[PDB]
Amino acid sequence: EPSPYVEFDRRQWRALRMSTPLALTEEELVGLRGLGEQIDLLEVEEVYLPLARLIHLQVAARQRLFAATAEFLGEPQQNPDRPVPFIIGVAGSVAVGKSTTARVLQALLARWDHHPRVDLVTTDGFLYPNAELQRRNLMHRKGFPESYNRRALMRFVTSVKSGSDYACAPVYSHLHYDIIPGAEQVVRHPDILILEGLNVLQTGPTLMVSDLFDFSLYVDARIEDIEQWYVSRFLAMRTTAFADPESHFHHYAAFSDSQAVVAAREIWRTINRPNLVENILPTRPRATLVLRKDADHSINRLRLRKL
Amino acid sequence: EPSPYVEFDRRQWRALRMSTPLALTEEELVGLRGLGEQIDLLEVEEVYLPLARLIHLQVAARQRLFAATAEFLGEPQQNPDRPVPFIIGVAGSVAVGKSTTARVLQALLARWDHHPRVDLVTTDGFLYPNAELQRRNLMHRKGFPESYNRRALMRFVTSVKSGSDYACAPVYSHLHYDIIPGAEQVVRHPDILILEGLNVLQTGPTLMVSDLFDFSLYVDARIEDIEQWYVSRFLAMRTTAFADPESHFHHYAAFSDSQAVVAAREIWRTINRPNLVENILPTRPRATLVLRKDADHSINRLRLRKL
Numbered sequence: 035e036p037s038p039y040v041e042f043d044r045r046q047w048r049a050l051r052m053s054t055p056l057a058l059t060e061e062e063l064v065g066l067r068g069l070g071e072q073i074d075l076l077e078v079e080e081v082y083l084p085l086a087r088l089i090h091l092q093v094a095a096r097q098r099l100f101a102a103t104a105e106f107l108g109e110p111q112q113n114p115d116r117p118v119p120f121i122i123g124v125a126g127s128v129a130v131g132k133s134t135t136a137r138v139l140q141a142l143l144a145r146w147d148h149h150p151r152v153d154l155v156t157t158d159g160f161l162y163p164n165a166e167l168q169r170r171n172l173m174h175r176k177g178f179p180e181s182y183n184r185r186a187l188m189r190f191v192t193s194v195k196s197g198s199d200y201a202c203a204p205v206y207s208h209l210h211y212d213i214i215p216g217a218e219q220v221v222r223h224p225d226i227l228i229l230e231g232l233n234v235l236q237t238g239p240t241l242m243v244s245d246l247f248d249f250s251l252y253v254d255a256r257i258e259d260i261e262q263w264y265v266s267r268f269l270a271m272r273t274t275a276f277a278d279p280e281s282h283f284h285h286y287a288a289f290s291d292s293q294a295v296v297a298a299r300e301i302w303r304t305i306n307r308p309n310l311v312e313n314i315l316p317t318r319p320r321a322t323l324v325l326r327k328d329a330d331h332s333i334n335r336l337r338l339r340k341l
Numbered sequence: 342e343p344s345p346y347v348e349f350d351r352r353q354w355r356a357l358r359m360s361t362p363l364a365l366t367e368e369e370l371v372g373l374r375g376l377g378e379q380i381d382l383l384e385v386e387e388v389y390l391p392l393a394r395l396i397h398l399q400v401a402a403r404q405r406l407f408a409a410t411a412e413f414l415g416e417p418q419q420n421p422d423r424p425v426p427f428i429i430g431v432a433g434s435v436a437v438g439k440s441t442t443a444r445v446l447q448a449l450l451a452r453w454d455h456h457p458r459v460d461l462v463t464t465d466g467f468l469y470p471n472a473e474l475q476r477r478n479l480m481h482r483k484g485f486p487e488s489y490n491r492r493a494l495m496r497f498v499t500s501v502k503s504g505s506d507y508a509c510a511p512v513y514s515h516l517h518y519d520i521i522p523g524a525e526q527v528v529r530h531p532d533i534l535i536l537e538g539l540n541v542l543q544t545g546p547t548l549m550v551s552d553l554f555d556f557s558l559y560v561d562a563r564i565e566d567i568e569q570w571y572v573s574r575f576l577a578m579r580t581t582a583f584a585d586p587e588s589h590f591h592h593y594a595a596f597s598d599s600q601a602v603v604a605a606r607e608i609w610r611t612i613n614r615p616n617l618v619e620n621i622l623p624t625r626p627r628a629t630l631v632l633r634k635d636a637d638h639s640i641n642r643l644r645l646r647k648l
């Protein structure tokens with residue numbers, strides 16, 4: 035039976051690096067790595083370097099597409115130093131590593147030959163502010179599609195992709211667990227924009243950011259491993275993030291192991307798991323590349339859309 | 342505010358014909374034209390000839406895309422006489438003319454320079470048989486997404502697009518209003534496949550045929566004009582299709598004008614209108630080209646996705 039997809043193991047995937055140079059130190063890697071992530075330079079070589087090659091092939095080809103349409107329209111012909119921005123989505127559960135995957139990809143792409151402006155935007159910035167989530171009764175549904183300003187998000191990406199000189203995104207504080215009054219992240223005609231968040235691959239009765247992606251990544255694992263990663267990170271954060279007395283979640287710092295395991299499982303149960311099953315996981319079939327992790331965080335399997 | 346879309350009037354659209362030759366006679370047109378359609382050679386020149394140009398530009402460019410991915414994969418390099426089939430979806434309400442739009446497009450494309458094999462498949466073939474729709478209680482929901490074998494449909498298109506030597510579709514009788522035992526439409530590595538039906542542009546929790554389209558058309562009009570077209574065609578068919586004594590709908594042939602208007606409005610009300618509002622119309626935002634008709638069937642407006 036034919037298939038839109040081709041499966042790979044790590045063996046088969048890493049043979050597709052060919053000549054791609056590794057342009058990243060073990061220290062540089064460390065500063066991109068998230069708490070509890072296991073990615074090392076081997077993973078970068080065997081997994082991210084083929085990915086970066088695939089993308090660089092598709093960038094140039096994807097630009098022929100937009101050029102056909104401008105030829106058709108009888109249009110100027112595009113300043114070769116403002117091409118149509120290549121837009122990359124990165125999706126997956128809370129805790130699955132997707133933020134690391136995206137920072138790593140940005141660093142690999144920024145170090146490609148001619149130094150492309152490669153911007154990274156997470157959807158956190160487009161969450162409704164808490165006072166607005168309260169109004170909507172959504173303070174316990176952060177991460178659910180409806181907790182985001184999806185219209186503002188779509189505007190932002192439509193602005194960038196349509197060639198705008200600048201586009202602004204709001205900024206979320208993880209310390210305060212709320213949007214920061216007055217803060218802007220300003221994206222300036224980048225060559226590549228990576229957009230990272232839980233539900234970025236969603237589709238619906240309107241045109242959405244997924245409809246603008248030229249390439250998409252989904253970072254996957256079994257649900258039970260993700261929960262284990264999530265709980266263990268919650269426990270770890272008792273002495274990193276929760277320890278700051280300003281942290282919205284400071285009360286958690288003084289939880290016993292067992293108490294924190296109880297809190298963490300409840301949050302997973304009531305918020306993150308439902309979101310993953312109801313909203314995120316149904317977007318996986320469309321991702322261009324699914325990156326499949328084993329219980330140790332290791333990417334050992336891959337699924338590429340060839341159609 | 343920037344926009345994925347550009348709007349056109351007929352003036353602006355038809356200037357984009359450039360050199361495209363008209364390769365179709367007034368008689369050839371007639372045999373493609375559906376009952377109550379008003380399309381003539383002018384419409385073909387000013388509307389379909391630019392469309393055919395747009396497509397021919399995108400075909401060659403879309404093939405660079407699939408070629409990038411085979412380069413990446415270290416793959417043979419594609420027999421230039423079996424390229425990856427370009428897949429075109431055509432959608433819209435019952436009665437809106439979409440079947441004519443598709444037959445016309447096929448004829449225009451087949452007459453392009455090097456004589457591309459251009460196949461046309463409607464989703465009718467993939468309706469569940471009546472005995473199966475009865476089983477599911479769906480005999481009065483023909484046209485609703487669930488009245489189709491969507492898995493078989495997706496298989497068919499995945500087969501063709503992935504380069505298969507042949508792929509078979511079942512065949513629906515409009516005379517008998519049921520699938521024909523033993524009938525097959527056989528599609529053989531065409532260069533272009535047009536797929537036409539009500540809901541072909543749908544998205545969902547699985548990969549669907551819309552995810553395989555390289556280009557999509559939606560044929561649009563105000564809902565009240567479509568109803569008027571539908572009712573008037575139902576009345577007309579009293580002496581064409583319904584007149585055949587074998588026709589499943591023969592009892593309608595003997596309806597008075599007023600009685601047929603009553604029957605037709607009820608079918609619109611209970612089946613076609615709900616389907617259009619709930620299922621078809623929410624797919625319009627994704628179509629590459631929306632063809633907007635006035636109350637006389639005339640295409641006077643267009644909306645192209647540039648993103």
Ligand SMILES: Nc1ncnc2c1ncn2[C@@H]1O[C@H](COP(=O)(O)OP(=O)(O)CP(=O)(O)O)[C@@H](O)[C@H]1O
Binds near residue numbers: 268
């Ligand atoms: N259990 C929890 N409760 C509150 N805040 C949490 C949390 N777990 C993580 N956070 C915070 O929110 C963000 C979590 O990102 P998330 O887990 O959704 O994606 P991810 O898995 O890609 C992060 P990374 O790849 O860097 O490990 C981090 O910035 C962290 O500070």
Ligand SMILES: Nc1ncnc2c1ncn2[C@@H]1O[C@H](COP(=O)(O)OP(=O)(O)CP(=O)(O)O)[C@@H](O)[C@H]1O
Binds near residue numbers: 439
């Ligand atoms: N009111 C009705 N009741 C039963 N059968 C009908 C019908 N109206 C049309 N049909 C039949 O079913 C098909 C209708 O196609 P539909 O209206 O869904 O698309 P369309 O508007 O693109 C057709 P065309 O473009 O040729 O006018 C035709 O083959 C016709 O024989």
